[PDB]
Amino acid sequence: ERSGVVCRVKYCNSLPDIPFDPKFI
Amino acid sequence: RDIAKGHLKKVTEQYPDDVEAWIELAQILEQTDIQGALSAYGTATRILQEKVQADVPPEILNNVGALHFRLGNLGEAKKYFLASLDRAKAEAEHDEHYYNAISVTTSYNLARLYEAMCEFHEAEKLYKNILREHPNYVDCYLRLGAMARDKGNFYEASDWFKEALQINQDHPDAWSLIGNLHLAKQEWGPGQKKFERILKQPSTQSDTYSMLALGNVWLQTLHQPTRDREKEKRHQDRALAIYKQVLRNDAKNLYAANGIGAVLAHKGYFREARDVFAQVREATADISDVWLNLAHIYVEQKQYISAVQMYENCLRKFYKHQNTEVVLYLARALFKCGKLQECKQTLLKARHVAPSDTVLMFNVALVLQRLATSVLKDEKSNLKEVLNAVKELELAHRYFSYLSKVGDKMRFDLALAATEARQCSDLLSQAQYHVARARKQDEEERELRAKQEQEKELL
Amino acid sequence: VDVTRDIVSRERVWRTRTTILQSTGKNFSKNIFAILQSVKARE
Amino acid sequence: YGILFKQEQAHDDAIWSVAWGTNKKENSETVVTGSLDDLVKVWKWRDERLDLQWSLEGHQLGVVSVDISHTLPIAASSSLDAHIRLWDLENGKQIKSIDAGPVDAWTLAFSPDSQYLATGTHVGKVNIFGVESGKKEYSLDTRGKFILSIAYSPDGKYLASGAIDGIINIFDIATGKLLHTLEGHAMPIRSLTFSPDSQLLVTASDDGYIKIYDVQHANLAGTLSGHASWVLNVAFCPDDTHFVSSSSDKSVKVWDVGTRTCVHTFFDHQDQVWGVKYNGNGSKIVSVGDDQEIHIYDCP
């Protein structure tokens, strides 16, 4: 309407964690 | 390695009694395509049977189960690990080859598999079996910690993680995971300089993962009202400096480029952002962040019909049925009809799992207000919908009252519901105006159906 | 102990942390640093 | 063991709650559904086939809970509207609308004698309502953050509450006081089920952990790992031998009470299942979800 919907707009950035692939003998 | 590939496809078609030729085929194929390694192991399983009916050594079978772990073949991967452990048991006397140690890492893989089954009970069992017999091992010590991290941070999750540093303070993976715990506590933002400085010893450096974590904890500082105070401008340029550093040491990191595009988008260069995010977009689509950040640009051009589809494309991961910030970032300047009522439906979906939010109950009141003023002003509309309009704005006024009594807001007090209250009062007046018009349109439709009744009597 | 070196030698790591961040294609950063300098040309 | 009935596109919008009547007050013959499309569809399961008996409206927001009385052929519905509408099923007519104003309303539960009506509230109180009065008789006040899940003891002697971050609160409904404040979970609980003998209790959090607690001394009988997603709904097999698990990954694992074993899993909903209930013995199993398609699972 008079103004848009409110948001805490952030261009965030995530991180992958440690994979732990099953090991290869 | 390329010459290895050439020699391997120099001998794969051949057979000068090829035995291990498939073993060293797949031994480089584990970096590469996994299916090639599968095929190599497939005929390698056979080739140990014809010269003599010899059981396949369990190192092969453990590794092919390890391949199927990253494939969909999880069940026969489990069968591979079982028969691997049996064949290691069939290596009854081979402590030279250390079948016991092979069983240790095989059990580690199988516990990691039980985690993929979400059989965390048996995962606990295998992990504690190994740690009670080889407590020097760390990865089992922290996957247990990771499992309780899935339950939560201040568990023995955090303590297995810290004792993993106690057994091995040189261990960068666990040390990173220490601050990964502290990512949950974002109020421990500026404190993460210290807990991500400990292994900024240059034996561990360069650690791209940690320094990108520094960039990320440095970017969460942004979107504050202190940018005009040059503070977040300095923060933007400091994150930019981190991103230049990781740029020079690695051109092919993608989380970096996501960071550069994010900080310049926070610098207001959104036409200068979709391009840099386009690069990581072809690089790999399977980064959940870039889906959001592109659609933020789209709604910044008000390109909703390019944005919300890619939002629900981000919803195509098997992570969470109502992620909250995604539908928040969905319902932003949503102004068309489905951008209003189906917007309400999305807000209801979020509210269903998140009825605690003040912002969400404010936003449903907002969108109900928008649709109420969409049906009473130039409308001249249906009876039933304007009957629903008074109830829905009454509900909206209930939330206007309810939120205003609450103290805590999203660090911006919502006494703005008060002007919505004067609005909804004049909307009551407008509704009392237009419900009379509804009765008028009802009586004229009655008279015209009388008019068709008489003429059909005439026919 | 002997178990530690005994296992970490014989296994292999094909999947680490750092090359997750690095992309499997070849996305150089000159284009990235060119537009980095280009926004500095607006500055 | 499989699916008997599948009900294609049973609702316009996603179902959130299910109610299948257990008795022989013509409620084994029917199903009650509660959805986002504001439709309370009374589904008469007649001739072993699922027919629409009534479609009830007026819940202006999406329905959060539906339930069927043990001792009566009537039903009740809640939503975000905070107008807990009470429904008569022989006619498909509303008995009353209990305004749990202004917003302070959550999922409901028919009492085992169907006299008291428990619900969750934003403050942490548990508000009890007269089925005849529509009035908040008394609120079971146990502080916390938000109340998400509740269940009566079917033998009518306790209450248990699941909160927004894993708070388990044990009550004596004969006196309405808190017995135990159990804390085995940290992540939100959406469903909890008293045992048919009310000797055990099931927990369904965002961790896939079915932590089963004893009731008579209020201790952990055992934790059971479940799906990969969030487990959402649970019902006991009424002969007190199994329990079913609705999750957030299009998958319904069926569990043994004792051996802690997924005795069966269905995958049949292509979308996230929300609600589950058994047969009067537990052979039939009803099941809803965002597929808007209701799957009925015969399980001998």
Short mmCIF file of N, CA and C in Angstrom, two decimals, chain B residues 47 74 77 166 200 213 219 242 255 291 296 301:
data_model
loop_
_atom_site.label_atom_id
_atom_site.label_comp_id
_atom_site.label_asym_id
_atom_site.label_seq_id
_atom_site.Cartn_x
_atom_site.Cartn_y
_atom_site.Cartn_z
N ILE B 47 37.58 -60.74 -11.89
CA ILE B 47 38.89 -61.18 -12.35
C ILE B 47 39.64 -61.95 -11.27
N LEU B 74 22.57 -47.06 -1.66
CA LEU B 74 22.91 -47.03 -0.24
C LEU B 74 22.78 -48.41 0.39
N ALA B 77 25.49 -50.66 -0.78
CA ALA B 77 26.67 -50.13 -0.10
C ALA B 77 26.78 -50.68 1.31
N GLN B 166 41.32 -31.11 22.22
CA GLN B 166 42.18 -31.51 23.33
C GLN B 166 43.06 -32.70 22.95
N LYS B 200 45.05 -19.62 12.84
CA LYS B 200 45.71 -18.76 11.87
C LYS B 200 47.22 -18.75 12.05
N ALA B 213 35.05 -18.05 6.21
CA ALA B 213 34.21 -17.92 7.40
C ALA B 213 34.40 -16.56 8.06
N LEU B 219 30.32 -10.31 7.06
CA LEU B 219 29.21 -9.77 6.26
C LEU B 219 27.92 -9.76 7.05
N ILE B 242 39.09 -9.07 2.24
CA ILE B 242 39.14 -10.52 2.42
C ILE B 242 38.83 -11.23 1.12
N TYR B 255 32.13 -19.52 -3.49
CA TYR B 255 31.61 -18.84 -2.32
C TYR B 255 32.22 -17.47 -2.15
N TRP B 291 20.48 -18.87 -5.33
CA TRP B 291 19.07 -18.82 -5.68
C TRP B 291 18.37 -17.64 -5.03
N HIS B 296 16.60 -11.70 -5.08
CA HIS B 296 16.64 -10.38 -4.47
C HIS B 296 16.87 -9.30 -5.51
N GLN B 301 14.38 -5.28 -9.37
CA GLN B 301 13.75 -4.75 -10.58
C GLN B 301 12.25 -5.02 -10.59
#
